[PDB]
Amino acid sequence: FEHATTVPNVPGIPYKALVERAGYAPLNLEITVVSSELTPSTNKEYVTCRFHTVIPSPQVKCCGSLECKASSKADYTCRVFGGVYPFMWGGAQCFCDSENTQLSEAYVEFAPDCTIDHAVALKVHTAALKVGLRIVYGNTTAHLDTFVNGVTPGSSRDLKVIAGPISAAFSPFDHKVVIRKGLVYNYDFPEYGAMKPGAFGDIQASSLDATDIVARTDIRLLKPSVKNIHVPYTQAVSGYEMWKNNSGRPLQETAPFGCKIEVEPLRASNCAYGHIPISIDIPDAAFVRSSESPTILEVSCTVADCIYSADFGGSLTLQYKADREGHCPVHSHSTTAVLKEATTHVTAVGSITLHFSTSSPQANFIVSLCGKKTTCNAECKPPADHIIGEPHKVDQEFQAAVSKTSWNWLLALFGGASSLIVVGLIVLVCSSMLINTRR
Amino acid sequence: FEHATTVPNVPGIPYKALVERAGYAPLNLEITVVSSELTPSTNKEYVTCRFHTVIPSPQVKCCGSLECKASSKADYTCRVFGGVYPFMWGGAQCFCDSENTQLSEAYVEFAPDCTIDHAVALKVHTAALKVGLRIVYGNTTAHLDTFVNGVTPGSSRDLKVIAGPISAAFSPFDHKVVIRKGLVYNYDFPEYGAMKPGAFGDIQASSLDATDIVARTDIRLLKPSVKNIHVPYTQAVSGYEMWKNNSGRPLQETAPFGCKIEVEPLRASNCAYGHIPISIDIPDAAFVRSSESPTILEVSCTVADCIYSADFGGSLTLQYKADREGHCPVHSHSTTAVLKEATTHVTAVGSITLHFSTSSPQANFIVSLCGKKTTCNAECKPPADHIIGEPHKVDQEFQAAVSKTSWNWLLALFGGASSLIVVGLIVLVCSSMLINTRR
């Protein structure tokens, strides 16, 4: 027996259903999304951090002439200066003081502490949703993990479940993401090679230990002026530090739909949105024919005080006549009414107290016990409490929250105009026909 | 001095231009796409190969009953059977002829040869193009590698180039790709976990040696039926072999635009399509004032026999009168004409014979020598050969790819009708005027 439902993607909130086989007793089913993991596919564009600007020791030709040779270091910069005549401790490191060419060399690398403090740039793609699910049918329960795509099945030893696709796809991540010490930022970054001094990614590499480090930090050498040997230079501030100062709040604190952004691997956990269509192939052994479970004769519903709060703020009683002691499942067949309990011991003759939650000001919902139904009609007051730390267990339906008094008044006011226009038309027709007869 | 051009993305075919700063002599710029690789953003989803069906040794509880457990191994399959009464070599392996419960266990792993003979399933997205470009300006030639996106720059010691964005976006790879031994296939494969037995991807894993292998080979065990011990079983045929047999042609032999597909990393080299905009800031040292380069007093053009084709089949002669001996650049500003030479020696007065190629039936193209123009008009016949092993160096237009004789005939036959209609309107107006005046 294959049963298909549309379970709301709301972790921690059970969904109750009643499989109603044609020739067998109905069986209870409860569906609990224990966990969900929306994980995208990531590729490491590069890793950036506070660059260490390393300046190799300057070299001086005595009074000959040096030349700048091209290298492959990150933002390699080299310059030639004329007569310098450097001083160290005696004060003359070079003879022939004129034409005293000096070479100034500088480049950048990764700082020693970058092994931990570093930002990884990623491009995220279409994200697949995986849900951990607990299903309990009748007396037997099972745990499983499935992929929400509509093709990937889940198998638990008798149970075959097909989940998905999601009704409305959503990915909190933009096209491009940055990861720093577990903090996620949806901040666009320059592409590989497209580097900008003073901005994020002002030093890029494929790995911390990778030797193909590429840098463009806008470093320029300056002519030395003091007698003592030293190479001056100027350089733009670390754009990584600038981004860190102006990083903004991480995605953990601004991801919509209230869900935890985790790393290693990048993913979003317990993240409620839309619905999942799930089809379960219940094993035939679970069912039992209606001749075994007692079938009640007649049942009546008396609704107690009801409040359409976010919790089980309603109660009712079911008075039943039956043939034998049993364990009937109890269900609510309305979309704006849920029940705390799914099954109950049932005697031959008696009554049972039940609890329920709703969201409309009116209750007009169908309860059912060992298959057979009964309407319950009631008026519910607004909830006394303003705020609860518990999510709403149902959703108010389109124009189903209109109370009986409001319905009566609105229908009366519209029907007044409707009656007025029809009597106007019949009066007009009567006058026209009267004139035609007496014309 | 920034000069912007639209270089056609065609490897091996030079693009020639003339930069004309107002107060300085013109300079010749040859721009040659030596190499160009388009690499997409890639991420490994899983690998697959022909499963090795590993079937552990059976166990018999010799006078009792066992229970099958559960494990996380790839496609863990286990079954329990009743009395078996197995034989080894002697004639007996259990007493208790009844109640000889047996356990059959089986699963799948990667075959030892899968370390090389395996397929990798990838998901690709928008691809950035990288161009290796040789630029010759004046008397200086330089080589560069850059990303054609309009922001990523390139620099060669005085040259400063910004290329992109590509005019037309194109990637020869569909959203899902497969790689096997360097052969690239544009195949749609099952998603991670969306595993169908008997087809490609029947086994998946994130790495060859990973222990978290997921597998679904549709393995079903049978009750042993012979006296001797064994574990009968049937299994779906390896879908990897089925895809190998029905792999079709690889993407190397189907990629359009003649794009050579290479692996490690996956990319397409020498992929000619569209045009790339390039802005080059030429160093000020190359330019020279007009007073130094010999300005030519005048020029006359005489075009010899020509055929519009890909090769340099057309020829012309320039009679030049000048004042000093120099090295003028020669250019064609027409879109449908290119020159073999870009810099030619010039004397006080003389003749120079040049070669050129075009694509129009008639050459109506303007040549320029040290900035001074000449509208070369000619009449090119269709070529002799049908097929050349050399690409066309000029695009085919519509406003110019029509013979002047056909232009004249078409215009005459279309203007005859216009003349007829205007004389018709004139005679109608004359008749109206005559009947109005004479009424």
Judge contact between A48 and A204, C-beta under 8 A: yes
In whole angstroms, what is the distance from residue A391 CA to residue A12 CA? 10
Cα(B44)–Cα(B46) distance, integer angstroms: 6
CB-based burial of residue B290 (10 Å sphere; 0-12 exposed, 13-18 middle, 19+ buried)?
Answer: middle
| Of the candidates A283, A277, A42, A303, the residue with the CA atom closest to the CA atom of residue A165 | A277
A69 part of contact set with chain B, CB < 8 Å: no
Cα–Cα distance measured from residue A132 to residue A141, given in angstroms and rounded to the nearest whole number? 14
Question: What does the CA dihedral B197, B199, B202, B207 come to, rounded to 10 degrees?
Answer: -170
Domain that residue A375 falls in: 296-379
Question: Residues A422, A397: contact at Cβ < 8 Å?
Answer: no
Cα→Cα distances B437→A294, A379, B424, Å: 112, 95, 20
Bridge partner list, B165: none
Residue B192 sits at the chain A interface (C-beta within 8 Å): yes
**What are A152's two structure tokens?**
């990937």
Q: Is B403 exposed, middle or buried (0-12, 13-18, 19+ CB in 10 A)?
A: middle
> DSSP string spanning A207-233?
SSS-S--EE---EEE----SSB----E
How far is residue B139's CA from residue A419's CA, in Å, rounded to a whole number? 97
Mutate to test the interface with A, among B71, B131, B152, B177 (most CBs of A within 10 A): B152
Q: For chain A, after which residues does the C atom lie more than 2.5 Å from the next written residue's N, i.e. where is it broken?
A: none
Cα angle, residue A384 at apex, residues A383 and A389 outer, rounded to 5°: 75
Closest CA to B173 of B272, B49, B38, B44: B38
Q: How far apart are CA A319 and CA B146, in angstroms?
A: 82
Q: DSSP secondary structure string, A106-173?
A: EEEEE-GGGGTS-EEEEEE---EEEEEEEEEETTEEEEEEEEETSS-EEEETTEEEEE---SS---SS
Closest chain A C-alpha to B68 CA, distance in angstroms: 11
Residues with Cβ within 8 Å of A399's Cβ and at least 6 positions away in sequence, in order, are none
A147 vs B151, B157, B194: nearest CB: B194
B76 touches chain A (CB under 8 A): no
Under a CB-based contact definition with an 8 Å cutoff, are residues A213 and A109 in contact?
Answer: yes
- In A, which residues are within 8 Å of B70 by CB distance? 157
Q: Is B10 exposed, middle or buried (0-12, 13-18, 19+ CB in 10 A)?
A: buried
* CA distances, A168 to each of A31, A175, A266, A420, B305 (Å): 20, 18, 21, 46, 69
Which residue of chain B comes nearest to A42, CA vs CA?
B43
Cβ atoms of B192 and B212 closer than 8 Å: no
DSSP three-state, residue A302: strand
Question: At A27, which helix (H) or strand (E)?
Answer: strand A27-39
| CA-based nearest residue to B265, from B346, B184, B165, B162 | B184
For chain B, give the number of residues: 439
Contacts (Cβ under 8 Å, ≥6 apart) of B286: B27, B137, B138, B140
Q: Report the alpha-carbon distance of residue B431 to residue B439 in Å, rounded.
A: 12
Q: Please, how many CA atoms are within 13 Å of residue A210, restricted to the half-sphere of its CB?
A: 13
Any idea what the CATH number is for the domain that residue A328 is in?
2.60.40.350
Which residues does A256 contact at the CB level (< 8 Å), separation at least 6? Answer: A172
Of B43, B147, B192, the CB nearest to A42: B43
A152 touches chain B (CB under 8 A): yes
| Rounded (10°) CA dihedral A192, A193, A195, A199 | 20
Question: Is the CB of B45 less than 8 angstroms away from the CB of A41?
Answer: yes
Helices (H) and strands (E) in chain A, counts: 2, 29
User: Which of A39, A41, A267 is the best substitution to test chain B (most B C-beta atoms within 10 A)?
Assistant: A41
Tokens of A177: 């993401």
The two three-digit tokens of residue A43, written as one number: 């590729």
Cβ A149–B43 below 8 Å, yes or no?
no
Q: What is the DSSP letter of A57?
A: P
Is the Cα dihedral A210, A215, A219, A224 positive or negative?
A: positive
Q: SS3 for chain B, per residue?
A: CEEEEEEECCCCCCEEEEECCCCECCEEEEEEEEEEEEEECCCEEEEECCEEEECCCCEECCCCCCCCCCCCCCCCEEEEECCCCCCCCCCCCCCCCCCCCEEEEEEEEECHHHHCCCEEEEECCCEEEEEEEEEEECCEEEEEEEECCCCCEEEECCEEEEECCCCCCCCCCCCEEEEECCEEECCCCCCCCCCCCCCCCCEEECCCCCCCCEECCCEEECCCCCCCCCCCEEECCCHHHHHHHCCCCCHHHCCHHHCEEECCCCEEECCCCCEEEEEEECCCCCCCECCCCCCEEEEEEEECCCECCCCCCEEEEEEEEECCCECCCEEECCCCEEECCCCCCECCEEEEEEEEEECCCCCEEEEEECCEEEEEECCCECCCCCCCCCCCCCCCCCCCCCCHHHHHHHHHHHHHHHHHHHHHHHHHHHHHHHHHHHC
Q: Which residues pair with A140 in a beta bridge?
A: A137
Query: Residue A6 corresponds to which tokens in the numbers above?
Result: 């549309």
Q: Of A184, A211, A181, A213, which Cα lies nearest the Cα of A122?
A: A184
Given B42, B149, B191, which is nearest A43 (Cβ)? Answer: B42
Is there a contact between A145 and A156 (Cβ–Cβ < 8 Å)?
no
A106 burial type by CB count under 10 A (0-12 exposed, 13-18 middle, 19+ buried): buried
Cross-sheet strand order for the sheet of B296-303: B296-303, B314-322, B349-358, B337-339
Euclidean distance between CA atoms B131 and B255, whole angstroms: 19
Rounded Cα distance, A129 and A273, in Å: 11
CA–CA dist A336, A49 (Å, integer)? 54
Chain B positions in Cβ-Cβ contact with residue A191 (cut-off 8 Å): 128, 147, 149, 151-152
Q: How far is CA B372 from CA B299, B344, B348, in A?
A: 8, 14, 15
Rounded Cα–Cα distance for residues B325 and B212 (Å): 79
Tell me, what amino acid is at A130? K
B152 contacts A191? CB cut-off 8 A:
yes
Kindly state whether A149 is in contact with chain B, defined as any CB-CB distance less than 8 angstroms: yes
Cβ atoms B392, B310 nearer than 8 A: yes
Chain A and chain B share a number of CB contacts under 8 A equal to 44
Q: What is the DSSP letter of A46?
A: E
d(C-alpha B184, C-alpha B403), whole Å: 46
Residue written as token pair 């190499």: B35
Encoding tokens for residue A54? 């390393």
Give the 3-state secondary structure of residue A259: coil
Residue A171 in contact with partner chain B when CB distance is under 8 A: no
Q: How far is A358 from A308, CA to CA, in rounded Å?
A: 5
Go through B175-191 and write b for each residue having 16 or more CB atoms within 10 A of its CB, e for each that does not: ebbbbbeebbbbbebbb
In b/e form, how buried is each residue of B245-273, taking b as 16+ CB within 10 angstroms? Answer: eeeeebbbeebeeebebeeeebbbebbbb
User: Shortest CA distance to B218 belongs to which of B192, B243, B238, B240?
Assistant: B238
Q: Is A193:A121 a contact under the CB 8 Å cutoff?
A: no
Kindly list the residues from chain B whose CB atom is less than 8 angstroms away from the CB atom of residue A126.
Answer: 123
Q: Which two tokens stand for residue B92?
A: 């007996």
Say yes or no: A294 contacts chain B, CB-CB below 8 A: no
Could you tell me which residues come within 8 angstroms of residue A353 by beta carbon, excluding any fewer than 6 positions away?
Answer: A315, A316, A317
> Token pair of A379, please?
């008026």
- Assess A42–B contact: CB distance below 8 Å, yes or no: yes
- CB–CB of A266/A183 below 8 Å? no
Question: What residue type is assigned to position B35 of the chain?
Answer: S
Which of B41, B152, B157 has the CB atom closest to A43's CB atom? Answer: B41
